[PDB]
């Protein structure tokens, strides 16, 4: 059938692009020590999270999905699923932290200079990592490598998370659907919406002052274009976030609440593409936050 070939092609492509992109981000940000801004510090942390997401999700999803059998051991199942959950949690929280940074920087630009400083950025990194490690500890516990048998008589294993009770599994995936989606997504929409409102009110004030509290500005057309491009980037960020994570967390809610009907319909190829989009987030993020930015591109020319 055709699905294995396109799966292999697209997984191979997004793996190669994610590895190359995030290693470029890392080498640029560790090499240009003057470039480690608080934002670039978060972008370094996010690129590490997305490299770890790529390396410890994509092969361990594709190969067991192609082979329909978890060829690795229970210890690998624990380690892999732990790094998956950790890298998802950290990627999400770092996106939230960049959103609240930007909210401070644009919408409270002076008051945020009291607290937005590299020490704070490291404190928030250490908190988001340590929290993600702590909250993801059920994964390396209850991800039993529950065995089965195929159509043939050979026994085979599959790595799956089975928290002790159905109500407990529902509680877990609802808490995840809040804290790693709805709360991130509402906080991102509030942050980037208040930023968009501020920048658009500035555009309106500059246009009305061009027709002869915000202030008279000799803005070039390039500054209006830049502010519009920032708005478009913020909308692209929010939309690509919802496009990348509503499918997986909605699928996981369906499996938590209607397990049989969900797995019947989504198992195999469909969930493989839902996860491919989820990891496509790990490629989109280094693009928007690093390769889009002219300063990071200049550091890449200024470096290896």
């Amino acid at each position: 059938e055709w699905q294995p070939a396109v799966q292999i092609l697209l997984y191979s492509l997004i793996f190669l692009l994610s590895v190359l992109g995030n290693t470029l981000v890392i080498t640029v940000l560790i090499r240009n020590k003057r470039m480690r801004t608080v934002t670039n510090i978060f972008l370094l942390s996010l690129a590490v999270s997305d490299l770890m997401l790529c390396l410890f999700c994509m092969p361990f999803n594709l190969i067991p999905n192609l082979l329909k059998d978890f060829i690795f051991g229970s210890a690998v199942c624990k380690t892999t699923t732990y790094f998956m959950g950790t890298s998802v949690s950290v990627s999400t929280f770092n996106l939230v932290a960049i959103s609240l940074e930007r909210y401070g920087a644009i919408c409270k630009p002076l008051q945020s200079r009291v607290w937005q400083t590299k020490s704070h950025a490291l404190k928030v990194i250490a908190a988001t990592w340590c929290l993600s490690f702590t909250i993801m500890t059920p994964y390396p516990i209850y991800s039993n490598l529950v065995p089965f048998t195929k159509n043939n008589n050979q026994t085979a294993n599959m790595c799956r998370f089975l928290l002790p009770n159905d109500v407990m599994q529902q509680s877990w995936h609802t808490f995840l659907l809040l804290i790693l989606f709805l709360i991130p997504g509402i906080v991102m929409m509030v942050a980037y919406g208040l930023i968009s409102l501020e920048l658009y009110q500035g555009i309106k004030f500059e246009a009305s002052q061009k027709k002869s509290n915000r202030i008279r500005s000799n803005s070039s057309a390039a500054n209006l274009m830049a502010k519009k491009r920032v708005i478009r980037m913020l909308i692209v960020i929010v939309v690509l976030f919802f496009l990348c994570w509503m499918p997986i967390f909605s699928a996981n809610a369906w499996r938590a609440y209607d397990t049989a009907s969900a797995e019947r319909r989504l198992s195999g190829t469909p969930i493989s593409f839902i996860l491919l989009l989820s990891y496509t987030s790990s490629c989109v993020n280094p693009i928007i936050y690093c390769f889009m930015n002219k300063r990071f591109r200049l550091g890449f020319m200024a470096t290896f």
């Binding site: 999700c57 959950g85 994964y139 991800s143 195929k150 995936h173 797995e263 989504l266 195999g268």
Partner: peptide, 8 residues
């Protein structure tokens, strides 16, 4: 069989 997915 192989019915399911890992959570992430």
């Amino acid at each position: 069989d192989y019915m399911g997915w890992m959570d992430f």
